[PDB]
DNA sequence: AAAAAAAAAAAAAAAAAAAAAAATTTTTTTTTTTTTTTTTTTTT
DNA sequence: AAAAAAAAAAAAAAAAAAAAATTTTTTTTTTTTTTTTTTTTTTT
């Protein structure tokens, strides 16, 4: 073991002196209260001292306390101006330290338990981000031996509670004296107080009768999130293990249901309270949250799943949706910029694989086959939580903004079919069922796959794939896939280009009005099922193609390629 | 007892910058006296209790 | 609930391990460790002034909060004595730390042992009052189950001062299977335990006030170091005791003083020497061995004039003869006893006070101050057990020591006869119906009687003029007659001496306000104690020449012709006078460090008796 | 010098103070196991 | 389209667990008091 006064001196000199003053700029910003959270980096601390880093890895919580108090004492010399007191909480802390100065009597000694505590008066928070040397360990493998140890984990989210105010330091005021006592909370529960240990009360022999209130207290942004093993992490036959993670301060509202996360934290226990001993629950106290691995033209479309061959126009339309047609809300009525595709196909052309690649691709994606997600799996339902009937979502509401890759749409349940019709038509999901009376909001885009009328009449593109056996086509595809087995754009760069492409917002020009109306009527005569939905289809595809070009104005080239795609699909 | 701790507080502040060891504020007894005539030991009835 | 580390304990143990580490210094505490290891004693006495000079703050801390501090000290002691010898350090489950030195503010008396000194090692002088039976206390108790062939060792913590729980105090008697357990007394481990009671000395205490006393719990290592009546300085931890369990408490906390050590406050067992002093004594003996008795005799009792024969005789007393215990226990004494009889203002009482201040274990007895049962021993019942205990008297306290009898003439005949067996055989055979014993008081007696009529009449015979029986004057072996001649010439002598001593001052130490072998020869005018102390042990056997000469001179003294007419005997010449001759000869030889009593010492003894006994009554 | 009288000592017995010693099941809560009812999802 | 299997939610009951709780009496100890013996001291 060591001496933690020495450790605090070590980290104080470190935080002052390491680098542009890397940590110094952060310190002065939080001193002025231009940031509320701080993040230590064990790579940046292994830059000089490895023993301290190994100790942090092995007993991280204590050093968290050390670092935070060290920065708290470094605060005022870095402070340089009068902050504007942006919060009533700021008013309280300023008033508190003001009256402490007023009745200071600096020579006068005060007890070891008569002082405003750090956890109350800090007003900032300090977290970490574990070193690259620290391998992220399997959620199953983070056992009792790793309690207190600093540990990073990578897992999928299943469900996440909302931001409700956890208590940090309850504040009580008296009925006679007027002092203000604190109960610093740590655990899931606290017994309230009813008597005031203020020395005026001890002198008076008065009934304390202090009353808790929220005004002088210190709440915090608290969430309990769930996480689940990676299906690749899971062993041969066991189901994926879960884990509970606790999210505080400026770590709140990062992860969301369905999004992969990497959380860096410590695996601390709670009291369990039927075999003897002293049992205890386990929660991982998050200290850095980073979404990762899903939610961080011609060559581009060919880059969309290079392992598939042919279907070039299909890939181009897939790229187009991934860019997304322009979102419009003109005159109240919504004209959503979603693009809905269905792939009817002969048995086996890698349509499921295309859906899986889009699932791996999009920043929000949910790949649902027939019956694994049915009823509540696609819809939203009710569950016990602060215990409560928390209404949470299924696949589509998880994919509220993204892409639902629905597989085998032909054989879905009829309720699932009805819900998907609703979401494609109006991007809501109305429910008036047994214990649910809601209208979920689901701004999702549908990629249906199926095997061979309502489909044709409610969509923006249907594609029939008939692998008519052509010798040269099959020869080239066979060479291609055999080469794939033989040898076994980057996804991140592709997704970056798409992400930037999402936000150019073109507005249609007047020059193309005659062209688009003429093309619409001509397509109608060539038909004589097409209608206003197909008009909106060509128009959305034109907007999205302008987005792909990145210009803010749609042109004749865009509409030409749109008609090219739709002609290829229909034929 | 109020007088006793009052004496204690004023004592610590007057001797305030004390040296090592002698810092825990020691208890300050407050004995009394007067100038009035003492009353006889036979005059302690119940009412003067 | 084992402590991983404490900065306080680690710091204190490091400091005291340094304090014990004595090689770069002179090696004093290392030598103390080595000698106590050689002795098998297991307490080491650390001087508080040493601790203060090396680290004042630790001295302040320890003298303010003892027990845990001394736990640190004793753990350091165990580690240190293990480094010197691990085998011996393993031998004793604990080693202890006695104290010594200038406990400046921490020196009070039991009247002044206030409630400010709790858990502080207080220093306190005082007289013992009680001596409880030194009885065992069990510390580690072993048991044997014969049904299950099992052995157990219950363990006890000496919570004489802290809180104690029944779970700690259980003495097991049955196993888990309700079998019978038989104690293994020998395999168990015990420590002695005694209570005593120190008291404020009546010479120190306030004159008109009741005594005040403090209770002292001597555990092992300090069993018999304090009997009733002794002067003792106790240094140790005043604390509080736990009331036994019970839902109520008054605030009362009867307090004790768990003594850290106790030493003889008499400070008269003082053989403190150095090798240089031993060599000094050796040369002082051997260079001028033949004149050394007269050197010592003239030296002894400065601040008084003449009386050279009496100084020689008091030397013969203090140096002592040699006690003899023959084959069958016929114990022939080896002490001198002197009766000063002489006119008033002859410094007889001043000689008595000199030997009181100098001779180790000297004690004063007045005529009607001490009386019989006080003088010799006594037998009294306990009243707590109805058993007869023995209360040692003045003489028994003065066993192998000196008693100064002021105004011996005034002791009534009962006590004057009660002193008989102590005078001859140096024992008091006391007995009442329950208990009897022969207490041993090998005492020596210097007794200053005064003459009948208040002053010696020259013409009257000494036997008429002394109000003491021939019976007793036999037992006394020398009777010295001190007359005030009143001549102006010797008056000039004595007067100049006396007023010179009135003019002698503390050299330099004083300004005008009132309160080495040889001495720096101050014109106006320690090693005495050193040399006489070493002198006492030697047993100089009598030579054939000395025995024949002393025998013939005794025969001459017995014969009436040896005294001329007009002289009157002062003490009849019984065989006690011959034994006096032998004892005085041995005392002279012991002065010389002879290893044999020779004719020189024999003729000195015969000169002594011839001057002392036969007196010239004038007409 | 020995007898008589008085004083003190030794030892047993009693009165109060204050610290020790002894006695000592029954009613309420609440988790867990089991059953029951209304509803939704699925199958004939 | 009707039947039925399953699901979640709600409730009852039995087993285990939770919680509440000073007063009276006895015995050692200390301290004096009283008796009787022993001792010492004064008298003829
Ligand atoms: N060009 C290609 N690249 C990679 N895989 C291919 C290709 N052509 C065919 N496949 C294979 O076809 C198989 C069936 O695809 P699948 O997604 O099941 O289509 P569907 O589910 O629509 O029938 C996949 O296992 C895939 O490996
Ligand atoms: N031999 C002496 N030498 C010097 N001074 C003497 C001598 N004898 C007596 N004195 C003086 O006479 C005083 C007599 O005191 P002290 O001895 O108490 O009385 P006493 O002699 O009657 O016992 C002493 O203080 C001392 O100063
Ligand atoms: Mg498929
Ligand atoms: Zn209050």
CA of A349 to the centre of ligand 1 (A): 5
What whole-number distance in Å separates Cα of residue C158 and Cα of residue A278? 33
Q: Could you tell me which of C446, C148, C461 has the C-alpha nearest to residue C317?
A: C446
Tell me the β-bridge partners of C439.
Answer: C428
What whole-number distance in Å separates Cα of residue A540 and Cα of residue A336? 9
What nucleotides of chain E have any atom within 7 angstroms of a protein Cβ?
9, 17, 22-23, 39-41
Q: How many CB atoms lie within 10 A of CB C589?
A: 32
What whole-number distance in Å separates Cα of residue C588 and Cα of residue C293? 7
Q: Could you tell me which of A84, A148, A96, A150 has the C-alpha nearest to residue A122?
A: A96
Q: Could you tell me which of C209, C110, C201, C193 has the C-alpha nearest to residue C158?
A: C193
What whole-number distance in Å separates Cα of residue C19 and Cα of residue C138? 33
3 state SS of A41: coil
Contact A355/A315 with Cβ under 8 angstroms? no
Q: Is C346 in the pocket of ligand 2 (CB under 6 A)?
A: yes
The DSSP secondary-structure symbol of C615 reads: B
- The enclosing H or E element of A24 equals helix A22-31
What separation in angstroms does the CA of A95 have from each of A91, A92, A100, C38?
6, 5, 9, 72
> Half-sphere exposure of A359 toward its Cβ, with a 13 Å CA cutoff?
19
- What is the length of chain C? 619
What whole-number distance in Å separates Cα of residue C51 and Cα of residue C104? 14
- The enclosing H or E element of C33 equals helix C28-39
Residues 6+ away with beta carbon under 8 Å from C456: C341, C342, C343, C465, C481, C483
In angstroms, how far is CA A49 from the centroid of its own chain?
Answer: 34
Q: How many CB atoms lie within 10 A of CB A343?
A: 25
Q: Which two tokens stand for residue C575?
A: 């065989």
Which atom from ligand 1 is nearest to the alpha carbon of A343?
A: 22
- The enclosing H or E element of C341 equals strand C337-342
> Half-sphere exposure of A64 toward its Cβ, with a 13 Å CA cutoff?
22
- The enclosing H or E element of C497 equals helix C488-503
Residues of B in contact with A109 (CB under 8 A): 23, 25
Residues of C in contact with B21 (CB under 8 A): 60, 64
The DSSP secondary-structure symbol of A376 reads: G
Q: Could you tell me which of A288, A291, A214, A292 has the C-alpha nearest to residue A248?
A: A288
- Resolution for this model in angstroms, one decimal place? 3.2
Is the CB of B17 less than 8 angstroms away from the CB of A107? yes
Contact A254/A269 with Cβ under 8 angstroms? no
Radius of gyration of chain C (CA): 30
Output the CA torsion C527→C530→C536→C542 (10° steps).
-50
- Ligand 1 pocket (Cβ < 6 Å) reads A 307-309, 345, 347-353, 449, 477, 480-481, 484
Residues 6+ away with beta carbon under 8 Å from C341: C449, C450, C451, C456, C462, C466, C479, C480, C481, C482
Q: Which nucleotide is nearest to C380 (CA to C1')?
A: D10
Question: What's the angle, vertex CA C534, arms to CA C532 and CA C540, rounded to 5?
Answer: 90
Output the CA torsion A522→A523→A525→A526 (10° steps).
120
Q: Are strands A242-248 and A284-291 parallel, antiparallel or unpaired?
A: parallel
Contact A385/A225 with Cβ under 8 angstroms? no
* Ligand 1 pocket, mutate which of A310, A353, A450, A483 (most atoms under 8 A from CB): A353
Return the percent helix, strand and coil in chain A, to nearest 5: 40, 20, 40
The DSSP line for chain B is -HHHHHHHHHHHHHT-S--SSTTS----------SSPPPPGGG--STT-
Output the CA torsion A22→A23→A26→A32 (10° steps).
-120
Question: What's the angle, vertex CA A199, arms to CA A195 and CA A203, rounded to 5?
Answer: 95
Contact A180/A208 with Cβ under 8 angstroms? no
Tell me the β-bridge partners of A184.
Answer: A169
3 state SS of C299: helix
CA-based nearest residue in chain B for residue A205 = B2
Output the CA torsion A45→A51→A55→A60 (10° steps).
0
What whole-number distance in Å separates Cα of residue A98 and Cα of residue A205? 28
CA of C301 to the centre of ligand 2 (A): 13
CA of A424 to the centre of ligand 1 (A): 27
Contact C395/C441 with Cβ under 8 angstroms? yes
Contact A440/A428 with Cβ under 8 angstroms? yes
Q: Could you tell me which of C297, C238, C203 has the C-alpha nearest to residue C117?
A: C238
Residues of C in contact with B23 (CB under 8 A): none
Residues of A in contact with B2 (CB under 8 A): 203
All partners of chain B with 3 or more CB pairs under 8 angstroms: A, C
The answer on whether C489 is annotated among ligand-binding residues is no
CA C420 to C1' E37, in angstroms, rounded, equals: 26
Is the CB of A108 less than 8 angstroms away from the CB of B13? yes
What whole-number distance in Å separates Cα of residue A194 and Cα of residue A180? 13
CA C380 to C1' E38, in angstroms, rounded, equals: 13
Q: Could you tell me which of A392, A396, A389 has the C-alpha nearest to residue A448?
A: A396
Q: Which two tokens stand for residue C345?
A: 């203002």
Min CA distance, B48 vs chain A (Å)? 26
What whole-number distance in Å separates Cα of residue C445 and Cα of residue C439? 17
Hunting for tokens 């999130």 — which residue is that?
A225
Using a CB–CB cutoff of 8 Å, tell me whether A107 touches chain B.
Answer: yes
CA C381 to C1' E34, in angstroms, rounded, equals: 19
Q: Is C198 in the pocket of ligand 2 (CB under 6 A)?
A: no
Q: Which nucleotide is nearest to A435 (CA to C1')?
A: D39
The DSSP line for A87-149 is SHHHHHHHHHHHHHHHT--TTS---TT-S--HHHH--SEEE----TTSPPPPTTT--GGGSSS
Q: Which of B21, B23, B24, B27 to mutate to test the interface with C (most CBs of C within 10 A)?
A: B21
Q: Which of A109, A200, A204 to mutate to test the interface with B (most CBs of B within 10 A)?
A: A109
Residues 6+ away with beta carbon under 8 Å from C598: C543, C545, C546, C589
Q: Which two tokens stand for residue A512?
A: 């193309």
3 state SS of C123: strand
Q: Could you tell me which of C47, C235, C30, C218 has the C-alpha nearest to residue C126?
A: C235
The DSSP secondary-structure symbol of A402 reads: S
Using a CB–CB cutoff of 8 Å, tell me whether A106 touches chain B.
Answer: no
The DSSP line for C366-430 is -TTTS-TTTTS-EEEE-SSSS-EEEE--HHHHTTTSEEEEETGGGS-HHHHHHTHHHHHTSEEEE
CA A424 to C1' D40, in angstroms, rounded, equals: 25
């Amino acid at each position: 073991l060591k001496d933690y006064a020495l450790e605090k001196e070590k980290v104080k000199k470190f935080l002052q002196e390491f680098y542009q003053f890397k940590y110094g700029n952060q310190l002065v910003r939080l001193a002025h209260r231009e940031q509320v959270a701080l993040y230590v980096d064990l790579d940046d601390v292994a830059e000089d001292d490895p023993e301290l880093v190994d100790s942090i890895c092995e007993n991280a919580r204590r050093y968290a306390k050390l670092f935070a108090d060290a920065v708290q004492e470094l605060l005022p010399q870095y402070k340089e101006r009068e902050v504007v007191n942006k919060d009533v909480l700021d008013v309280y802390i300023e008033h508190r330290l003001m009256m402490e100065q007023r009745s200071r009597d600096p020579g006068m000694v005060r007890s070891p338990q008569n002082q405003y505590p750090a956890e109350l008066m800090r007003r900032f928070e300090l977290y970490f981000q574990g070193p690259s040397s620290n391998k992220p360990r399997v959620i199953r493998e983070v056992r009792a031996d790793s309690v207190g140890k600093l540990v990073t984990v990578r897992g999928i989210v299943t469900r996440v509670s909302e931001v409700k105010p956890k208590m940090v330091v309850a504040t009580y005021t008296c009925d006679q004296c007027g002092a203000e006592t604190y109960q610093p909370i740590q655990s899931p529960t606290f017994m309230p107080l009813i008597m005031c240990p203020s020395q005026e009360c001890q002198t008076n022999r008065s009934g304390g009768r202090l009353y808790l209130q929220t005004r002088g207290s210190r709440f915090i942004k608290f969430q309990e999130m769930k996480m689940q093993e990676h299906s690749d992490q899971v062993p041969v036959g066991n189901i994926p293990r879960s884990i509970t993670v606790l999210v505080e301060g400026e770590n709140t509202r990062i992860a969301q249901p369905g999004d992969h996360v990497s959380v860096t934290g410590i695996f601390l226990p709670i009291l369990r309270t039927v075999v003897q001993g002293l049992l205890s629950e386990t929660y991982l106290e998050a200290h850095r949250i980073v979404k990762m691995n899903k939610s961080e033209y011609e060559k581009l479309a060919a880059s969309i799943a290079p392992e598939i061959y042919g279907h070039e126009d299909v890939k181009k339309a897939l790229l187009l949706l991934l860019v997304g047609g322009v979102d419009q809300s003109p005159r109240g009525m919504k004209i959503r910029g979603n693009i809905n595709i269905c792939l009817m196909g002969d048995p086996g052309v890698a349509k499921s694989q295309l859906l899986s690649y889009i699932d791996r691709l999009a920043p929000r994606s949910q790949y649902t086959t027939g019956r694994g997600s049915s009823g509540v799996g696609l819809t939203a339902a009710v569950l016990r939580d602060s215990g409560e009937l928390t209404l949470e979502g299924g696949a589509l509401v998880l994919a509220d903004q993204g892409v639902c890759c629905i597989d085998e749409f032909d054989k879905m349940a009829e309720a699932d079919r009805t819900a998907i019709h609703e979401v494609m038509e109006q991007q809501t999901i109305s429910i008036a069922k047994a214990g649910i009376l809601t209208t979920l909001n689901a701004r999702c885009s549908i990629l249906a796959a199926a095997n061979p009328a309502a489909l044709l009449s409610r969509f923006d593109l249907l594609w029939l794939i008939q692998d008519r056996p052509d010798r040269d086509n099959d020869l080239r595809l066979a060479q291609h896939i055999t080469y794939v087995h033989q040898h076994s754009l980057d996804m991140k760069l592709m997704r970056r280009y798409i992400a930037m492409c999402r936000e150019k917002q073109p507005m249609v020009p007047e020059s193309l009005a005659d062209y688009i109306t003429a093309a619409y009527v001509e397509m109608r005569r060539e038909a004589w099922y097409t209608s206003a939905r197909t008009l909106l289809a060509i128009l959305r595809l034109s907007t999205a193609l302008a987005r792909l070009r990145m210009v803010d104005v749609v042109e004749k080239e865009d509409v030409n390629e749109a008609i090219r795609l739709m002609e290829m699909s229909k034929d | 007892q109020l007088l006793e701790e009052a004496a204690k507080e004023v004592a610590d502040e007057v001797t305030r910058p004390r040296p090592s060891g002698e810092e825990v504020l020691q208890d300050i007894q407050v004995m009394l006296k007067s100038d009035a005539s003492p009353s006889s030991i036979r005059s302690l009835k119940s009412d003067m209790m | 609930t084992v402590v991983l580390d404490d900065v306080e304990l680690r710091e204190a143990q490091r400091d005291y391990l340094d304090f014990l580490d004595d090689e770069e210094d002179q090696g004093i505490y290392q030598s103390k460790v080595r000698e106590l290891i050689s002795d098998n004693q297991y307490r080491l006495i650390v001087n508080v002034n040493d601790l203060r000079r090396k680290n004042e703050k630790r001295a302040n801390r320890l003298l303010n909060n003892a027990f845990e501090e001394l736990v640190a000290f004793q753990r350091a002691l165990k580690d240190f004595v293990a480094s010197i010898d691990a085998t011996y350090a393993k031998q004793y489950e604990e080693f202890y730390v006695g104290l010594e030195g200038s406990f400046g503010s921490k020196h009070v008396s039991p009247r002044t042992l206030t409630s400010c000194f709790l858990s502080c090692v207080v220093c306190v002088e005082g007289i013992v009052t009680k001596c409880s039976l030194v009885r065992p206390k069990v510390v580690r108790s072993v048991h044997y189950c014969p049904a299950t062939k099992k052995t157990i060792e219950r363990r006890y913590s000496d919570l004489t001062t802290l809180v104690a729980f029944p779970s700690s105090s259980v003495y097991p008697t049955k196993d888990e299977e309700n079998n019978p357990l038989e104690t293994e007394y020998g395999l168990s481990v015990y420590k002695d335990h005694q209570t005593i009671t120190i008291q404020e000395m009546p010479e120190k205490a306030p004159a008109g006030q009741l005594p005040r006393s403090v209770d002292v719990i001597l555990d092992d290592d300090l069993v018999d170091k304090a009997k009733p009546g002794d002067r003792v300085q106790v240094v140790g931890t005043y604390r509080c005791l736990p009331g036994k369990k019970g839902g109520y408490t008054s605030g009362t906390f009867r307090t004790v003083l768990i003594a850290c050590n106790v030493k003889q406050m008499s400070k008269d067992a003082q053989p403190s020497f150095s090798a240089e002093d031993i060599a000094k004594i050796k040369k002082f003996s051997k260079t001028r061995s033949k004149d050394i008795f007269d050197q010592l005799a003239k030296s002894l009792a400065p601040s008084i004039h003449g009386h050279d024969y009496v100084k020689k005789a008091i030397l013969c007393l203090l140096l002592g003869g040699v006690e003899r215990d023959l084959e069958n226990g016929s114990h022939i004494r080896g002490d001198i006893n002197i009766l000063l009889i002489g006119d008033p203002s002859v410094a007889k009482s001043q000689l008595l006070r000199y030997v009181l201040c100098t001779a180790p274990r000297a004690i004063p007895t007045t005529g009607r101050g001490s009386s019989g049962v006080g003088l010799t021993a006594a037998v009294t019942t306990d009243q707590e057990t109805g058993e007869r205990r023995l209360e040692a008297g003045a003489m028994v306290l003065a066993d192998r020591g000196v008693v100064c009898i002021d105004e011996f003439d005034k002791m009534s005949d009962m006590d004057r006869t009660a002193i008989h067996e102590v005078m001859e055989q140096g024992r008091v055979t006391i007995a009442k119906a329950g208990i009897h014993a022969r207490l041993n008081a090998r005492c020596s007696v210097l007794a200053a009687a005064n003459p009948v009529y208040g002053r010696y009449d020259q013409y009257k015979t000494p036997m008429e003029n002394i109000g003491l029986q021939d019976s007793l004057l036999s037992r006394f072996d020398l009777l010295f007659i001190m007359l005030d001649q009143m001549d102006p010439e010797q008056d000039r002598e004595i007067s100049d001496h006396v007023l010179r001593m009135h003019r002698y001052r503390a050299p330099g130490e004083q300004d005008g306000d009132a309160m080495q072998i040889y001495e720096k020869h101050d014109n106006l005018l320690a090693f005495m104690k050193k040399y006489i102390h070493v002198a006492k042990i030697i047993k100089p056997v009598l030579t054939q020449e000395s025995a024949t000469y002393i025998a013939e001179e005794y025969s001459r003294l017995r014969s009436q012709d040896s005294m001329s007419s007009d002289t009157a005997r002062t003490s009849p010449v019984t065989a006690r006078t011959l034994e006096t001759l032998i004892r005085l000869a041995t005392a002279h030889a012991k002065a010389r460090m002879s290893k044999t009593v020779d004719l020189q010492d024999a003729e000195e003894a015969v000169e002594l008796v011839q001057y002392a006994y036969f007196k010239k009554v004038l007409e």
